[PDB]
Amino acid sequence: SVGFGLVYNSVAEAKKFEPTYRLVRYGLAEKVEKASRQQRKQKKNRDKKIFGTGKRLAKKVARRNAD
Amino acid sequence: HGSLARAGKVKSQTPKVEKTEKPKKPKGRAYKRLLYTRRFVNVTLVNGKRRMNPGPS
Amino acid sequence: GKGKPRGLNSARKLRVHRRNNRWAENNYKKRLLGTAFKSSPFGGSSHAKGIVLEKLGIESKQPNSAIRKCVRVQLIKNGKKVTAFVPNDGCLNFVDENDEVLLAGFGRKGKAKGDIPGVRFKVVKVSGVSLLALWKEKKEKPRS
Amino acid sequence: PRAPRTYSKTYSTPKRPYESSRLDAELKLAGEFGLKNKKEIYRISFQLSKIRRAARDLLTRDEKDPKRLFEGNALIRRLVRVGVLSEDKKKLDYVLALKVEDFLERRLQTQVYKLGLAKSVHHARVLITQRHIAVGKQIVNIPSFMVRLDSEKHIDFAPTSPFGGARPGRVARRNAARKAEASG
RNA sequence: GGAUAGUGGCCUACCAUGGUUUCAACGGGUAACGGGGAAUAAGGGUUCGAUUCCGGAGAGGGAGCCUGAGAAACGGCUACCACAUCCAAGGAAGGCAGCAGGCGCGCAAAUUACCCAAUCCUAAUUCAGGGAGGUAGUGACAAUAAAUAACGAUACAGGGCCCAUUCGGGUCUUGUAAUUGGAAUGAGUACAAUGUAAAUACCUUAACGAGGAACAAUUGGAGGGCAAGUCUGGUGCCAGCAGCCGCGGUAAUUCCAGCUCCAAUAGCGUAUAUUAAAGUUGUUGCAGUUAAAAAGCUCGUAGUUGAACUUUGGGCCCGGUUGGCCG
């Protein structure tokens, strides 16, 4: 079997030059938990649908629900 | 003339028969070897025209 | 001699004459006129679906004695009534009426095949099942 | 978007489909070289016709034509390398007049059949398809391989191969246990 | 002169009557986006090219426009025209000819999967974003290699050559005639190792998978072209076959059932279009007395074509080229 096998100078340089997929496959980093792309884009759409933080929106929702 | 019927008369009235029992014959490579052995190296029937599937007589 | 012009500057004459006389070819004329798009029941298509209407017991031409049990079919895209042959045995009994048939040509680019007049198409399916698989009982006609 | 992947056909079928002479010639060639289908003979005929077309389009020009030296030399070298041309006949008229028998005589299946490790070309192709041949340091499962003349000397049992040792065999021990069970 | 970033009937005013055309203008058709290309394999050619690349164009139909360097932009607006949820009968918001998916048309095709891992682009610029892209499912439009297994024993009928005491034997398997056992293999077991994003896709495994009513191969045909049945049973102008000729008035080598088969053979049959066949479009290269075709005859313009003749041929000198004063 022949494959791309390579070495770095040190572990810190390895971490600074390798992306997280290689890091998690080599145990150099922890597998961070990410949401599905559809849901992340859905929330990217929702926070664009609403303008700003939405505190005034929550206040208005409470005012309307009080009716 | 008014014959929109009687379709498949022979299909109806011939007896339904199944093939006689026989083990599956060789297929493919073994089949072509049997063809070679019965066609080239067989001197059995080269009488006048070297028949291929001579009917019984 | 030999008719046609031979001059080095006669190319336009040769080309125009070839066009005029190429018009005399049967398939060239049909292909450029688009008779398959304006006059053909199939509209230049390889196949067409159909709804069978009734049965015809048109007899066979001489020297022969038989009927060829065709079906009258209304097309779906063209709205045209055609007479299509159903090849196999009992196929009339299988497409008695109102079934969903699939129709193709007959093998002679729009001519009657044998001793059957006025039929130029034949069926290759009935509502999803093939006529010969139906004939060999590998599959069964869907009543639903 | 993507660049298309180029494919090509390897066999051109004969125009006249059914003639006794050609049909019997190809059948006898396939049977006596231990082939299963006509795809092999059709593909090699297609290649041979391609080579003959190249040779004709080559010899249609005069000697010492610059493209002629290049292409004729490369074709001749490829032919002697594959082994169709004998070691001392580089004339290129025989390159035009090659034989499909000349091509298939070198075929690896017939090579192992001549070497006799299978006692029969049927068993020979069975071995090739079963991978009990390490052509070099790697095992080849194709009867059509156009060898490079070192595998001929290097033919042996692979380290992960039966009939050679270092392994008893799962079937061998299964039958040994079965014999033990039959005895007791 | 205006307008444009610019020239210009691009548009306005004035002036003259010009511009194209039988060398096909103008018009109609285009089941017409163009090219690089694909299919023939004598040459010449014929047909298509929506579509992996380039140049256009459009975002439902035209029209208008802001912003922006760059849009007449549509996942930007302004209206009209047909599509198009609710009403809390005030009114609001749009064009999937981007990706999956639905309905129609259907002859014409893919599941409402996953991610920026491998290619680029966008930005204030390493990092952030991308149904652009890449990775799976279905899928026989297509192309490669190549599974549906093969062994070895006479269960006697002379090939290299013999014993030379007429099949008495042949040491080999052929020159099979219905008894046939392995040392071994593949798809899939992927607990694991290669491998990407966590699984699958090539290579291995301590362990399973063949002794074949298991893992069992289809399509067209046996009259011809185009080899493959006077082999059987059934029907007997009737069911059919039959791409074309043809088959059957109780005996069908063609119809229905089987066996043998012949061809391709995980391939094959069928329908339409197209190429060669087609020297049945003929430039190469066809025919016109009787087979289709020489206009009834002549004139004649465009077109095509059109006699011969104008420096010919002798001299000298060399770089260098092919058996060739020479091995």
Coordinates of C-alpha atoms (C1' of nucleotides) in Angstrom, one line a residue, chain B residues 1 3 5-11 13-20 22-32 34-35 37-39 41-43 51-57, chain E residues 147-151 175-177 212-214 216-218 221-222 227-236 238-240 252-253 255-266:
Chain B
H1 CA -67.1 -11.3 -41.5
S3 CA -65.5 -13.1 -36.6
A5 CA -64.3 -14.2 -31.4
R6 CA -62.6 -17.6 -31.4
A7 CA -59.2 -15.9 -30.8
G8 CA -56.6 -18.3 -29.5
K9 CA -58.5 -21.4 -30.6
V10 CA -55.3 -23.4 -30.9
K11 CA -53.9 -21.9 -27.7
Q13 CA -57.2 -26.7 -27.6
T14 CA -53.7 -27.8 -27.6
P15 CA -52.6 -29.9 -24.6
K16 CA -50.5 -28.0 -22.1
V17 CA -47.3 -30.1 -21.8
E18 CA -44.2 -29.5 -19.7
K19 CA -40.6 -30.3 -20.7
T20 CA -39.3 -33.7 -19.7
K22 CA -33.5 -33.4 -17.4
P23 CA -30.6 -31.9 -15.4
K24 CA -29.5 -28.4 -16.5
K25 CA -27.0 -28.6 -19.4
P26 CA -23.6 -26.8 -19.3
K27 CA -23.8 -23.1 -20.1
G28 CA -21.3 -20.7 -21.6
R29 CA -17.7 -21.9 -21.6
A30 CA -18.6 -25.5 -21.0
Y31 CA -21.3 -25.2 -23.7
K32 CA -18.9 -23.9 -26.3
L34 CA -19.1 -29.2 -26.0
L35 CA -19.9 -27.4 -29.3
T37 CA -16.0 -31.3 -29.3
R38 CA -19.2 -32.2 -31.2
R39 CA -18.4 -30.1 -34.2
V41 CA -13.2 -33.3 -33.4
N42 CA -16.3 -35.4 -34.1
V43 CA -16.1 -37.6 -37.2
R51 CA -25.4 -32.3 -40.6
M52 CA -25.8 -30.3 -37.4
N53 CA -29.2 -31.3 -35.9
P54 CA -30.2 -34.4 -37.8
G55 CA -33.7 -35.6 -37.0
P56 CA -34.4 -39.2 -36.1
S57 CA -35.4 -41.5 -38.9
Chain E
rA147 C1' -19.4 -14.4 -12.6
rU148 C1' -23.8 -18.5 -13.5
rA149 C1' -18.1 -22.4 -11.4
rA150 C1' -13.5 -26.0 -13.9
rC151 C1' -11.5 -30.5 -12.3
rG175 C1' -9.6 -41.6 -31.7
rU176 C1' -16.7 -41.5 -24.8
rA177 C1' -20.7 -45.2 -24.4
rG212 C1' -25.1 -28.4 -8.2
rA213 C1' -34.1 -30.4 -7.6
rA214 C1' -27.9 -25.5 -4.0
rA216 C1' -30.0 -23.6 -12.0
rA217 C1' -29.2 -17.5 -18.6
rU218 C1' -32.2 -14.8 -21.6
rG221 C1' -35.3 -18.8 -35.3
rA222 C1' -34.7 -24.4 -38.0
rA227 C1' -26.7 -22.8 -40.6
rA228 C1' -30.2 -24.1 -37.2
rG229 C1' -35.7 -30.7 -38.0
rU230 C1' -39.5 -34.1 -43.3
rC231 C1' -38.2 -34.7 -35.0
rU232 C1' -43.2 -35.6 -32.4
rG233 C1' -48.5 -34.3 -30.6
rG234 C1' -52.7 -30.4 -31.7
rU235 C1' -55.7 -27.4 -35.3
rG236 C1' -57.0 -28.1 -40.6
rC238 C1' -59.3 -21.4 -38.9
rA239 C1' -56.6 -19.9 -35.0
rG240 C1' -52.0 -17.6 -36.4
rA252 C1' -48.1 -27.8 -41.9
rU253 C1' -39.6 -29.3 -41.7
rC255 C1' -49.3 -21.9 -36.9
rC256 C1' -49.5 -23.9 -30.7
rA257 C1' -46.4 -27.6 -26.7
rG258 C1' -41.6 -30.1 -25.8
rC259 C1' -36.4 -32.0 -27.2
rU260 C1' -32.4 -31.2 -30.1
rC261 C1' -30.3 -27.4 -31.3
rC262 C1' -28.2 -22.3 -34.6
rA263 C1' -26.6 -16.9 -33.3
rA264 C1' -25.5 -13.0 -29.8
rU265 C1' -24.8 -14.5 -25.4
rA266 C1' -26.0 -10.5 -19.1

